[PDB]
Scaffold this active site. Structure first.
Site, PDB file in Angstrom:
ATOM      1  N   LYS B  14       0.879  -1.355   0.058  1.00 33.39           N
ATOM      2  CA  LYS B  14      -0.145   0.044  -0.088  1.00 33.39           C
ATOM      3  C   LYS B  14       0.933   1.279   0.132  1.00 33.39           C
ATOM      4  O   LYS B  14       0.390   2.449  -0.196  1.00 33.39           O
ATOM      5  CB  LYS B  14      -0.943   0.164   1.233  1.00 33.39           C
ATOM      6  CG  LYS B  14      -1.975  -1.123   1.214  1.00 33.39           C
ATOM      7  CD  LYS B  14      -2.745  -1.281  -0.073  1.00 33.39           C
ATOM      8  CE  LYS B  14      -3.628  -2.474  -0.021  1.00 33.39           C
ATOM      9  NZ  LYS B  14      -4.150  -2.517  -1.345  1.00 33.39           N
ATOM     10  N   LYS B  74       1.244   5.133  -5.467  1.00 31.90           N
ATOM     11  CA  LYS B  74       2.172   3.750  -5.555  1.00 31.90           C
ATOM     12  C   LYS B  74       2.908   3.888  -6.833  1.00 31.90           C
ATOM     13  O   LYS B  74       3.936   3.446  -6.967  1.00 31.90           O
ATOM     14  CB  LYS B  74       1.125   2.778  -5.466  1.00 31.90           C
ATOM     15  CG  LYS B  74       0.869   2.364  -3.960  1.00 31.90           C
ATOM     16  CD  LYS B  74      -0.655   2.480  -3.499  1.00 31.90           C
ATOM     17  CE  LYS B  74      -1.541   1.712  -4.331  1.00 31.90           C
ATOM     18  NZ  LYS B  74      -2.917   1.803  -3.527  1.00 31.90           N
ATOM     19  N   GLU B 165      -6.228  -2.109 -10.421  1.00 38.82           N
ATOM     20  CA  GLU B 165      -7.414  -1.749 -11.240  1.00 38.82           C
ATOM     21  C   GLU B 165      -7.760  -0.459 -11.211  1.00 38.82           C
ATOM     22  O   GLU B 165      -8.558   0.073 -12.068  1.00 38.82           O
ATOM     23  CB  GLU B 165      -8.439  -2.765 -11.119  1.00 38.82           C
ATOM     24  CG  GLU B 165      -8.385  -3.936 -12.113  1.00 38.82           C
ATOM     25  CD  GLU B 165      -9.503  -4.843 -11.641  1.00 38.82           C
ATOM     26  OE1 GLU B 165     -10.638  -4.692 -11.080  1.00 38.82           O
ATOM     27  OE2 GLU B 165      -9.523  -6.095 -12.318  1.00 38.82           O
TER      28      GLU B 165
HETATM   29  C1  LIG Z   1      -6.770  -7.193 -10.578  1.00 36.75           C
HETATM   30  C2  LIG Z   1      -6.637  -6.595  -9.090  1.00 36.75           C
HETATM   31  C3  LIG Z   1      -6.599  -5.281  -8.932  1.00 36.75           C
HETATM   32  C4  LIG Z   1      -6.250  -4.280  -7.981  1.00 36.75           C
HETATM   33  N1  LIG Z   1      -6.381  -3.178  -7.855  1.00 36.75           N
HETATM   34  C5  LIG Z   1      -6.071  -2.760  -6.839  1.00 36.75           C
HETATM   35  C6  LIG Z   1      -6.274  -1.120  -6.550  1.00 36.75           C
HETATM   36  O1  LIG Z   1      -6.557  -0.448  -7.421  1.00 36.75           O
HETATM   37  N2  LIG Z   1      -5.612  -0.553  -5.333  1.00 36.75           N
HETATM   38  C7  LIG Z   1      -5.271  -1.307  -4.322  1.00 36.75           C
HETATM   39  O2  LIG Z   1      -4.992  -0.783  -3.071  1.00 36.75           O
HETATM   40  N3  LIG Z   1      -5.363  -2.769  -4.497  1.00 36.75           N
HETATM   41  C8  LIG Z   1      -5.457  -3.174  -5.509  1.00 36.75           C
HETATM   42  N4  LIG Z   1      -5.524  -4.727  -5.405  1.00 36.75           N
HETATM   43  C9  LIG Z   1      -5.055  -5.661  -4.614  1.00 36.75           C
HETATM   44  C10 LIG Z   1      -6.084  -6.270  -3.543  1.00 36.75           C
HETATM   45  O3  LIG Z   1      -6.702  -5.311  -2.828  1.00 36.75           O
HETATM   46  C11 LIG Z   1      -5.584  -7.493  -2.958  1.00 36.75           C
HETATM   47  O4  LIG Z   1      -5.183  -8.388  -3.766  1.00 36.75           O
HETATM   48  C12 LIG Z   1      -6.966  -8.157  -2.077  1.00 36.75           C
HETATM   49  O5  LIG Z   1      -7.182  -7.440  -1.020  1.00 36.75           O
HETATM   50  C13 LIG Z   1      -5.947  -9.272  -1.147  1.00 36.75           C
HETATM   51  O6  LIG Z   1      -4.999  -8.843  -0.670  1.00 36.75           O
HETATM   52  P1  LIG Z   1      -3.408  -9.297  -0.582  1.00 36.75           P
HETATM   53  O7  LIG Z   1      -3.066  -9.089  -2.072  1.00 36.75           O
HETATM   54  O8  LIG Z   1      -2.447  -8.546  -0.115  1.00 36.75           O
HETATM   55  O9  LIG Z   1      -3.191 -10.995  -0.474  1.00 36.75           O
HETATM   56  C14 LIG Z   1      -5.822  -5.429  -6.698  1.00 36.75           C
HETATM   57  C15 LIG Z   1      -5.938  -6.808  -7.003  1.00 36.75           C
HETATM   58  C16 LIG Z   1      -6.287  -7.483  -8.290  1.00 36.75           C
HETATM   59  C17 LIG Z   1      -6.306  -8.746  -8.438  1.00 36.75           C
END
Ligand SMILES: Cc1cc2nc3c(=O)[nH]c(=O)nc-3n(C[C@H](O)[C@H](O)[C@H](O)COP(=O)(O)O)c2cc1C
Ligand SMILES: Cc1cc2nc3c(=O)[nH]c(=O)nc-3n(C[C@H](O)[C@H](O)[C@H](O)COP(=O)(O)O)c2cc1C
Lengths: 217, 217
Positions: B14, B74, B165
């Site tokens: 983050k 980020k 995304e």
């Molecule tokens: C396709 C995709 C888009 C994502 N977009 C964002 C985003 O725009 N901002 C963000 O803070 N996290 C984003 N994430 C991270 C997700 O919040 C995170 O993967 C989910 O909460 C699971 O937590 P972890 O990755 O720490 O295991 C994205 C994850 C995926 C798979």
């Protein structure tokens, strides 16, 4: 190992050794890979069918009829067969289920943080399911992401696998009653250990050069 | 083994330390992951934008300016920023490129083998672009698979990352002229090392239980 070596050495097996099964631990480990894949807003819009028995694999293999017969034996001969499924529609019960799980796992210190998290997820959810009308496609993308995570994971476990799009989704959905439960099958991934008939195990890997696919800025 | 520990310990960063950069070798290893991800019929329907310079990263961060300020931070602080893009249409030129590359890598023993492989790929291609009219969505799914592979790979490399995304793909496409080159942006993945402000690095990971998401048969 080194993960780069894994990526360069892994391959799609075209023939499995039916005699070689996953160890009990390995069976658990591949399920852990499925569970802990990331997803957009941690929506986890998926379901997995893990077939390990002869009858289970046979049921999945029914989807390999007609023009998809070349993938039938892959499903039958593999030790385990994973069916990756996506939700058909993003509903509020699922959104509630996810944020409650996060609350239970201790990701929120205050009820305000939990409220913030939930409402943020609903915003993206609604953006897809009320504005763009692509939530079905949006959730399917998350599942393909899970698949990509999974293929690299099992290869790092020293396991053979092959992702399969060559199957009848209609038959597969019907066989396990997925439509009525709110899911649809997307990719089938047999896992195990290749046999000597696997021609792809000894063939060179082929990818487009980076000068075509990659731009540095 | 090892990979499971990676899957359980990795997280979406983050906040990135703007002082920590990838080594030149790590830069090469990241691009290797992008290149060698599998894809349906080895179609590789994608383009990557890897921003390593501050001006390059600023061009990418334009897609997040205003309505995605947290995403923008980020993108600006991370060492390298990868933009995953998908083809907008699967054309015959690309199909020829793929099969000629496989030929150049010595995957075919006979000219008939190449013709068979070629006809097989065009069959699935035609099925999507002409029968199902979903070749765009089909190719986008492959790119998400590449993301899933990538995130696990960079985590196994001991590097921090986050898939995003939350950006305006319209702005991003216009900034790099992707439309006219036949591509469109889907996911942005900043890569580097997290800072002290990365609260997610010390939060417990949360996933739905397997008795909800997984069926054994
Ligand atoms: C396709 C995709 C888009 C994502 N977009 C964002 C985003 O725009 N901002 C963000 O803070 N996290 C984003 N994430 C991270 C997700 O919040 C995170 O993967 C989910 O909460 C699971 O937590 P972890 O990755 O720490 O295991 C994205 C994850 C995926 C798979
Ligand atoms: C989404 C997807 C679906 C696939 N479906 C099949 C399939 O139905 N039959 C098959 O033999 N291989 C299938 N593959 C494997 C590809 O042929 C393989 O990934 C590609 O040729 C690259 O070779 P490699 O995976 O060994 O590196 C599939 C791969 C992906 C990513």
């Amino acid at each position: 190992m080194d993960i780069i070596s894994v990526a360069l050495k892994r391959h799609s097996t075209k023939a499995f050794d039916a005699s070689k099964k996953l160890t009990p631990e390995q069976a658990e480990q591949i399920k852990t890979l499925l569970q802990y894949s990331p997803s957009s807003t941690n929506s986890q819009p998926w379901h997995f069918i893990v077939a390990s028995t002869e009858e289970g694999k046979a049921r999945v293999a029914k989807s390999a009829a007609g023009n998809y017969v070349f993938s039938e034996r892959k499903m039958l001969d593999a030790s385990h067969v994973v069916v990756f499924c996506a939700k058909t529609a993003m509903d509020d019960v699922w959104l509630k289920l996810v944020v409650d799980q996060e609350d239970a796992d201790g990701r929120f210190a205050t009820p305000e943080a939990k409220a913030a998290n939930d409402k943020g997820r609903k915003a993206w959810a609604d953006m897809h399911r009320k504005d763009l009308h692509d939530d079905a496609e949006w959730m399917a993308k998350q599942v393909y992401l899970n698949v990509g995570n999974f293929l690299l994971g099992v290869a790092a476990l020293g396991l053979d696998a092959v992702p399969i799009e060559g199957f009848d989704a209609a038959i597969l959905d019907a066989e396990f009653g997925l439509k009525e439960k709110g899911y649809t099958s997307l990719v089938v991934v047999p896992v195990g250990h290749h046999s000597v008939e696997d021609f792809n195990a000894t063939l060179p890997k082929s990818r487009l050069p980076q000068n075509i696919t990659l731009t540095e800025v």
